[PDB]
Symmetry: C3
Subunit: 418 residues, 3 copies
């Protein structure tokens, strides 16, 4: 009778060992991870890269007759027949100027390049930048690097490219960061006389705070800043460490692109777009990097734009961009105050030779800074390693039947002898 | 002497095994969890449901003499004695309209319904919606579905109700989302001539971005949008998975509500309120769902409001809403640009046959989109499961005394003799 | 041949046990932790303390001739030679007043000057409501910061009970209508260090256990808008060494009852200024002597700036293990509505323009009646290590602690 109770106890114990062991094994092959959040104080923080664009792509006073000829349809200033659209709400002077530039009688077309057009007709930072301050000391427009995006000629402060060393901040708070007073030059905006898809009613700038290791993607990752306010941006540096397969989904390999030195998801997207447009239309857009020839406005109309839209719509499988394992993100909180005060309106108007109306509707102040001298870390950590797996299997294997790998080897010994 | 040192080693080993084993047991019985954060790229994102209200509950030009008679005191247009309050700083015409509407001389009242009054007097989406675009293609006011909230007649885009399929976005950024130009119609706002508790000075709209599975709760979960700016709202889809008892506190059961098909904490809140008001006052407010009769303004005055206030403090234990285990939340970052530009102000003024002053104080553009085509996941994960407990107990049990469950069974066997 | 493969299996098995066991040993000695996020529903939430300053340090109408004499250079209204700045863009009345106050023919405490000349909450506070019930200016406690005379609602200091809210949403919180008094702003005729073009207020939402640090931790609120602030209470629990970096011993400073990272920062600053200049600035607390405007120019400011740059290691403030933080999301609506501008203008005896350029409404509340908890939790405890080493020790060679002791015996005998 005792051998029966022993047989039942050994059988049930071996069954429990079976299901528990297969449980821990399956849990290991899920490759599970859990997250470790930490806050690290630092004596210094590397200030990020700040890219800003004017919402107006190009200045009206800088557009020329040749520009209307080649890119008149693309710039939406002229209709398909090289004639001005509906004149509703058209200033007499502006409409006469445009009508004069669109005469096109005995006109010899000069050579035209999209990057030349954006570079000269775009808003000059030397005119927009009314004042610059970093850590309380003056900055020059030479700190701003020209970057071409979908919005046109844009500028990146502290880009850290072309061998310039990146700036640091040793104190947090509103004073100890970037602080620029900009004039968005609303007088230079393209007149809107007729409704169009490209017609926009916004006035202000668009800013993206990003690491120097990634290029700007201002059309998607930027936030707007409106004239007439001083906007504060409190930043919190975040350092992210992800896990590669089979734990998570990250880009383990450096994967350097021909266009960009360091791999980033932004660089992967704009690289994918660049390759697609170069293959499909044999030309490259203004914002894209490389050595390819830039598109002509005819190529823009008949190939480039429908090609990108078709790439977005047809299938995401062509452009699948994984996230790198080491990522520096910047968190940001926005707040506003009014500019200028009644005590300063006259002084600003006289300082920049403008009317107080103009100052009120054209001046914005951007204040970008770190809230405090610390950074957060978010790390994906492996939850079950092979040492822990063997430890649990050994513990339960020793608890239920008290056997070992040598014991199973001995049972296989008798099986081979049998 | 050797058996004595052996006895000391076995005793100390058995004590240590005792305290370590009870340690792992107690840690298991705390039922602990830890969190798994992950970010997932996606080729498509389901666009959320967007509900907005005008801050002005009902239009002044649509209020009628009968409305003043029944709900004049409730709307704060008339005083306790059904008379207009002080006319201080009242436009002559503006007051003339109200004085004529509140005559009540030889007036034979007609039936009155609160939901009819809000549905007819509230701001019409056909007049507010100056332009609508979703993913660059035009939308109609018919895309917005009417929901009645505490703020009055409100509208939900991509509500996904009545069999409509939920919309998706295949690109991120400002262009590729919902983008509406609204006229908040500040001329239709209730005149404020005298101080009252209900008096408010704000002008604009209130928006809540929420999953289609939940009803809006704009009085608590909404954010404001001011006229004269294009407000960008960058959304981040977050997918949350919680643990039921005994690990955490989540809804293990489906939790069928009578009013709503899907369970949500909001649906639980307005369910608690609706049930409480039906039991105490036998009527429901406009925002509440169901089939009960709507309250009359007298019922609102003498029963509903004090009942809700008594519900907040006295019965704070009475309404307990557990959180569901699988929840889709949307995070948001707001930024603004100025509207309109000087190059467009007059074109807007002529396009909508308004003065530039009006455009300046009445037009707002709302741009709701996903920052990028990805979603975050926040999961509560069990930290100590029974397999790990048995493995650790077996490991320490085998390290300290080298025993097994069969060893203790044999010890009970020898003890049996 | 069988004993040879048995011996090799025991050798290799002991090697595997060695590397796995040392693996768990080293992993345990990393002292790792992982994060636990949780959301806790509550019937009540303790409302935070809200400190706000006007961006304008002191009122122009309250400055007197003596104040111009002593602190004229510091306040930037007068130059080093006690003369008026450039007369470009100067109000005729303001310039006549300043020249008259600067007559300096036949003609001071910093805290008296800030306390009396600063913006009075009794004039700024046009309306106050908390949970729908009226509040008085006496509920705000005066705190002196770098911005000047500032005010803290629900400060909870001096034994006052902390306020609670039993409902979430815009109505059920603090709601104040303020007049920033833009007419009292210092006239700016020439460039100066204090010169600012902003108009509005600065707010910091913080727990009562920590002092305000509004020049660094504040956000702006612009006039002409009602800004809503949705708050989410967060409770953070950190680990002390060797797991993390937290202050296990509170080691509260004499200046403040409860230890906070901010309180440690301003304590270090006060101590440094007392050591180098034998005086304390306006914002600093204690019983120490306040600086004179001459002391400010030649000692205080360069000492503070040099303290930030020269020795950043000197002030090391550890983070406490239990920290209550408040998350916040801002949004705006326009104030006043066209239907309400006239009533406000007449109610407060101002022009409709003045209301447009001076009135702001602040609405601070909890989004919902819950709070988040973020806890650092130990990933490998000594019981788990002994369990893993025991499991692998029993799987690979099947030995025990008693087995190793017996091996020491048999080795000792032979
Ligand atoms: C990602 O960041 C980690 C640190 O956060 C890097 O790990 C360091 O790698 C260097 C080798 O170049 C070592 O000298 C350091 O000791 C490592 N630090 C730690 C904490 O392990 C890692 O190399 C980075 N990965 C990439 C691809 O850049
Ligand atoms: C200010 O600008 C106007 C615009 O052309 C110009 O005529 C005037 O001379 C300028 N004044 C000064 C002082 O430069
Ligand atoms: C435009 O509005 C005015 C009143 O403001 C009205 O008289 C006129 O008929 C309107 N025109 C159109 C085309 O609606
Ligand atoms: C810290 O806060 C937690 C709740 O978040 C509480 O349980 C604990 O008692 C507090 N004190 C310590 C020393 O952890
Ligand atoms: C109202 O404002 C005027 C203009 O400054 C002032 O003279 C008058 O005294 C004010 N009324 C009161 C009651 O303060
Ligand atoms: Ba009752
Ligand atoms: Cl997992
Ligand atoms: Cl727990
Ligand atoms: Cl670790």
């Amino acid at each position: 009778l005792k051998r029966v109770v022993w047989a039942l106890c050994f059988m049930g114990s071996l069954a429990l060992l079976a299901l528990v062991c297969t449980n821990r094994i399956q849990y290991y092959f899920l490759y599970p991870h859990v997250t470790k959040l930490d806050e690290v104080a630092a004596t210094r923080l590397t200030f990020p890269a700040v890219t800003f664009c004017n919402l107006n792509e190009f200045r009206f006073s800088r557009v020329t007759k040749n520009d209307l000829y080649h890119a008149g349809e693309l710039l939406a200033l002229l209709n398909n027949r090289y004639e001005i659209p509906d004149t509703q709400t058209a200033d007499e002077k502006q409409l006469e100027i445009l009508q004069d530039k669109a005469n096109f009688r005995n006109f010899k077309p000069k050579p035209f390049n999209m990057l030349e057009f954006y570079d000269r007709a775009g808003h000059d930072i030397r005119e927009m930048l009314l004042s610059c301050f970093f850590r309380g000391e003056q900055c020059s427009p030479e700190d701003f690097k020209v970057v071409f995006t979908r919005y046109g000629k844009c500028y990146t402060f502290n880009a850290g490219q072309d061998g310039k060393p990146r700036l640091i901040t040793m104190k947090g708070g509103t004073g100890n960061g970037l602080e620029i007073m900009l004039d968005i030059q609303q007088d230079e905006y393209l007149p809107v006389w007729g409704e169009t898809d490209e017609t926009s009613f916004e006035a202000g700038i668009k800013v993206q705070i990003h690491s120097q290791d990634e290029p700007p993607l201002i059309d998607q990752l930027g936030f707007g800043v409106a004239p007439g306010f001083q906007t504060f941006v409190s930043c919190q540096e975040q350092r992210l460490i992800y896990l590669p397969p089979p734990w998570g989904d990250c880009k383990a390999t450096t994967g350097d692109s021909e266009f960009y030195d360091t791999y980033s998801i932004t660089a992967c997207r704009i690289d994918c777009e660049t390759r697609y447009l170069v293959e499909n239309c044999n030309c490259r857009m203004v914002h894209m990097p490389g050595d390819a020839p830039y598109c002509t406005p005819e190529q823009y109309k008949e190939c480039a734009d429908p090609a990108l839209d078709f790439l977005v719509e047809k299938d995401n499988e062509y452009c699948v961009c994984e996230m790198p394992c080491n990522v520096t993100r910047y968190g940001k909180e926005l707040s506003m105050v009014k500019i200028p005060s009644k005590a300063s309106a006259k002084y600003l108007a006289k300082k920049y030779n403008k009317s107080e109306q103009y100052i009120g509707e054209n001046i914005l102040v951007l204040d970008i800074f770190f809230e405090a001298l610390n950074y957060e870390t978010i790390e994906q950590k492996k939850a079950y390693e092979v040492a822990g797996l063997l430890g649990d299997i050994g513990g339960q294997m020793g608890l239920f039947i008290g056997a070992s790998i040598l014991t199973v080897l001995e049972l296989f010994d008798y099986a081979y002898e049998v």
